[PDB]
Design an enzyme around this catalytic site. Structure first.
Site, short mmCIF file in Angstrom:
data_model
loop_
_atom_site.label_atom_id
_atom_site.label_comp_id
_atom_site.label_asym_id
_atom_site.label_seq_id
_atom_site.Cartn_x
_atom_site.Cartn_y
_atom_site.Cartn_z
N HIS C 99 1.30 -1.23 0.10
CA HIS C 99 0.33 -0.04 0.23
C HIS C 99 0.91 1.28 0.11
O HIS C 99 0.68 2.52 -0.60
CB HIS C 99 -0.94 -0.22 1.44
CG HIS C 99 -2.08 -0.57 0.84
ND1 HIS C 99 -2.73 -1.00 1.97
CD2 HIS C 99 -2.75 -1.31 0.25
CE1 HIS C 99 -4.06 -1.78 1.42
NE2 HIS C 99 -3.84 -1.91 -0.11
N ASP C 122 -9.24 -3.69 3.25
CA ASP C 122 -7.18 -3.47 4.43
C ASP C 122 -8.30 -4.48 5.18
O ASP C 122 -9.32 -3.28 6.20
CB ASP C 122 -6.30 -2.09 4.10
CG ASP C 122 -5.53 -2.93 4.85
OD1 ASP C 122 -5.43 -4.28 5.39
OD2 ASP C 122 -4.75 -2.42 4.45
N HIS C 124 -5.67 -3.55 7.79
CA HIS C 124 -5.89 -2.75 8.32
C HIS C 124 -6.86 -0.82 8.19
O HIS C 124 -7.00 -1.10 7.00
CB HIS C 124 -4.01 -2.82 8.76
CG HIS C 124 -3.06 -3.27 9.09
ND1 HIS C 124 -3.08 -3.74 9.89
CD2 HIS C 124 -3.41 -4.48 7.96
CE1 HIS C 124 -2.14 -4.64 9.56
NE2 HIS C 124 -2.82 -5.51 8.74
N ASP C 126 -4.32 1.69 7.99
CA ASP C 126 -3.35 2.13 6.78
C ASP C 126 -4.08 3.68 6.95
O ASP C 126 -2.97 4.14 5.34
CB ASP C 126 -3.46 1.08 5.21
CG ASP C 126 -2.87 0.45 5.49
OD1 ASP C 126 -2.18 0.31 5.70
OD2 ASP C 126 -2.19 -0.28 4.67
N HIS C 139 4.31 1.52 4.46
CA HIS C 139 2.95 0.36 4.12
C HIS C 139 1.73 1.31 5.10
O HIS C 139 0.39 0.67 4.41
CB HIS C 139 2.98 -0.82 3.67
CG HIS C 139 3.02 -1.79 5.18
ND1 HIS C 139 1.83 -1.98 5.99
CD2 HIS C 139 3.58 -1.47 6.04
CE1 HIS C 139 2.00 -2.50 7.15
NE2 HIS C 139 3.19 -2.05 7.42
N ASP C 230 -6.34 -5.34 -0.59
CA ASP C 230 -5.60 -5.48 0.20
C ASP C 230 -5.73 -6.64 0.62
O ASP C 230 -6.75 -7.34 0.88
CB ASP C 230 -5.03 -4.42 1.74
CG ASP C 230 -4.09 -5.31 1.86
OD1 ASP C 230 -3.11 -6.07 1.72
OD2 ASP C 230 -3.24 -4.14 3.05
N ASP C 232 -4.42 -9.13 3.07
CA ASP C 232 -4.78 -8.93 4.32
C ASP C 232 -6.09 -9.03 4.87
O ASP C 232 -6.74 -9.61 5.54
CB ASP C 232 -4.09 -8.52 5.10
CG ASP C 232 -3.67 -6.91 5.04
OD1 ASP C 232 -5.01 -6.74 3.95
OD2 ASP C 232 -2.77 -6.50 5.69
N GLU C 275 0.05 -5.71 -0.84
CA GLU C 275 0.47 -6.70 -0.29
C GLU C 275 0.63 -8.59 -0.32
O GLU C 275 0.75 -9.30 0.38
CB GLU C 275 -0.19 -6.42 1.10
CG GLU C 275 -0.05 -5.01 1.20
CD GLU C 275 1.00 -4.16 1.96
OE1 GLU C 275 1.86 -5.11 2.96
OE2 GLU C 275 0.91 -3.83 1.73
MN MN Z 1 -3.55 -4.34 4.44
#
Ligand code: MN
Ligand code: MN
Ligand code: MN
Lengths: 317, 317, 317
Positions: C99, C122, C124, C126, C139, C230, C232, C275
């Site tokens: 990212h 995602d 996260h 971010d 990232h 993303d 993840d 990612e």
């Molecule tokens: Mn992520």
């Protein structure tokens, strides 16, 4: 009861598939104790025994359809047996096998109850015609021989001369579709077949999916249901030992919920547990998991609810 | 805050089970850093230490109920300790153990708050009476000693003479039931206990399940909640190292959502993390996964939301 | 069609991360046949080739932000390339990477379509700023360089002098958040960013989540969508070979449903598959599973529906 009055029919048949091995589907599903487990709940299980399928030695492909006479005669035999077990007022639990046997399992069931509604739980549509097929297998083309709307699009395949298409396009509901060929999808969208692909299940939740399924079939009029289950319909983490596993499918809970909601209608009148292939388990644990999942699905079709079942007696005595 | 003011009580007790090993539940749940992880969020954790359970050497079964005096005295001790930690205005986080300790964990909690509502997250009902039980274990019979509606159906078991049933039938909500004996299900349906078996969860979605749970308990009147979690309630893929894992249960996300919705009511007033059995992990990774899942559930009960938590300070400085 | 007119941009860049290895993201995503699979459906795939990222030898941290000049120049190069592929009327499929490249992938896309709405899938947020970050990686801070509401809270990081923040706070929707730092969550709640953390997904169902996402972005006015996926974001059981896997996330079916609902709007105008880290797969099967999942997500963004796709021809001929 009138429900869970099972008549079990073996169907150790695999010739409707590529190089097979599902013919030991009944063997494992029984050795995992299916009859012995169906008798604890109040089920009048009668084992009509594994069907003896006569051999067809010289049986050549039609155009691309592999070994059509074997499948056609096996399905005619199965349809005769299913009509036999439906004239006894039972629930034709045809545990196979491959969907190449669904032609027989539904054609026989429709000889008795002409107005059955089929709930097809399969990752695949299994609706190729012998013309639009690509692999030329018959496990992928059982619905096309049953739909009334595909008459004329089905060539006079050898061995399927007895097949009179029995279900309409508006009497079949697909649940769990996630692997559909372009020809299968064209047929699916043209005929207006009600289908709940994996996307519709994710959108609606399995609860709403089954509510719409039953309100679509049993909404206009109560009719027999023929749940033609296919163990590749469930996610490969739960049924890995199947022919063509497709990742990202119905979970164990969703399959159990489908069967429980079908049972609670009390209109279940036929059940197929197809495509259990103990030869494709990478490890014996995979085969055990697939067979246990198929057995759990089968039991849940016949009253075994997750909330728990009790006999109509006073347990606080 | 008044919430997440935890009082942790160990309960390294396993005699309410068959041949056990869950007594090292507190040991692993703490060595996996539960107190150290509960202190990052603004929690006033006070460790009341693992309970010293006096030994009962000669302790023979009652009729079929294994070792009843041990369980009865252990639960009386735990109930005394839980009343002690509730008189301090804390949240009695009793991490055990087995549900044979739920008798104490809820009876003590009800000494202080008589009107608590219990949310029982377990794959099992755990509602056998000492008469209707089949295995004669006490991990499977903690609710039957608590329900007011089962008075007279509970024999004078040795060691449970102190137990005054505290919760009504309409103050307990089961979530995650997927393994219910016939006697348990008869009791469950006769008393009109509100339960959300795995089928109801699949039908409704965990969001609607928790909405109905909280509107049923905290709908008529706000009351303390005693979430009596059981790690076999979650699917065995997430908590494999438990006593009697039952396949096809609550997912990790669903367990976290249950705990988050219970916390956000701010009425959580007692929590039990039972049946963590590090001796049944096939591999140490299985034990680690079970303990991490139990810890994550516990943390989420005390404010740790998945969307992320921030202290009430200006982070853009 | 105007949709699925893809322009593929490699981005073999990993310097925005800790000790990396995601730079072989494009290599594996292509060697797993992404272009060859995007051409069966009617997609006008044009491969703009892996971006040549010039080396920055002497590139020291800013305050704690590791290697900022490398990331800043790599993202400027990527933004230039993305503007190039958007002036051709294509869909900038930037497959990376990390990212830290989203800054470029969205800043370039916003040079052409200023009013894009970003759907950030995602685990996260971010959204750390170079001040509120803790690991000092880039990232984890690509959104903070894009939001107009964080101007003044973003220091003049070396190499990011070209970045003009392009998206508002009300043009980004997070889906799948389950690992949010306190600073990230403060920023998320202060700006009023619409986010569907894992809890909201569990509460609503992914179907309702995507309905609200699209009614929030494309409700007031139809705008381009920049799905910045993303891997993840999906559960680690499906994408284990990613940088920071967080357990209990979007399932395979939920990710496919997100992408299918984004595609069916027909407004998708940019896609990032970030990612993918084939060096963190414990076994080659893990890398294969992550890459297959990323490829399936990518395909589903461009018409590959689970119900099945057919060309507009008469298949019953
Ligand atoms: Mn992520
Ligand atoms: Mn199938
Ligand atoms: Mn339990």
């Amino acid at each position: 009861a009138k429900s869970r009055t099972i008549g079990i029919i073996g169907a150790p048949f695999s010739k409707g598939q590529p190089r097979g091995g599902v013919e030991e589907g009944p063997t494992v599903l029984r050795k995992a104790g299916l009859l012995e487990k169906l008798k604890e709940q109040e089920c009048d299980v009668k084992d009509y025994g594994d069907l003896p399928f006569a051999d067809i030695p010289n049986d050549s492909p039609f155009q691309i359809v592999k070994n059509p006479r074997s499948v056609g005669k096996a399905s005619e035999q199965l349809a005769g047996k299913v009509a036999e077990v439906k004239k006894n007022g039972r629930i034709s639990l045809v545990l196979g096998g491959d969907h190449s046997l669904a032609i027989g399992s539904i054609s026989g069931h429709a000889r008795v109850h002409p107005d059955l509604g089929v709930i097809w739980v399969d990752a695949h549509t299994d609706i190729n015609t012998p013309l639009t097929t690509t692999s030329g297998n018959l496990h992928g083309q059982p619905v096309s021989f049953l739909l009334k709307e595909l008459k004329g699009k089905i060539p006079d395949v050898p061995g399927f001369s007895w097949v009179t298409p029995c279900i309409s396009a508006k009497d079949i509901v697909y649940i769990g579709l996630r692997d559909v060929d372009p020809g299968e999808h064209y047929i699916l969208k043209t005929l207006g077949i009600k289908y709940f692909s994996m996307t519709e299940v994710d959108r609606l939740g399995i609860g709403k999916v089954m509510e719409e399924t039953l309100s679509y079939l049993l909404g206009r009029k109560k009719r027999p249901i023929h749940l033609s289950f296919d163990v590749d319909g469930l996610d490969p983490s739960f049924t890995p030992a199947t022919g063509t596993p497709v990742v990202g499918g119905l979970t164990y809970r969703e399959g159990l919920y489908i069967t429980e909601e079908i049972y609670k209608t009390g209109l279940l009148s036929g059940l197929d547990i197809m495509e259990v292939n103990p030869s494709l388990g990478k490890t014996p644990e995979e085969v055990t998991r697939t067979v246990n999942t198929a057995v759990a699905i089968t039991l849940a079709c016949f009253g075994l609810a997750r909330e728990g079942n009790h006999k109509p007696i006073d347990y606080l005595n």
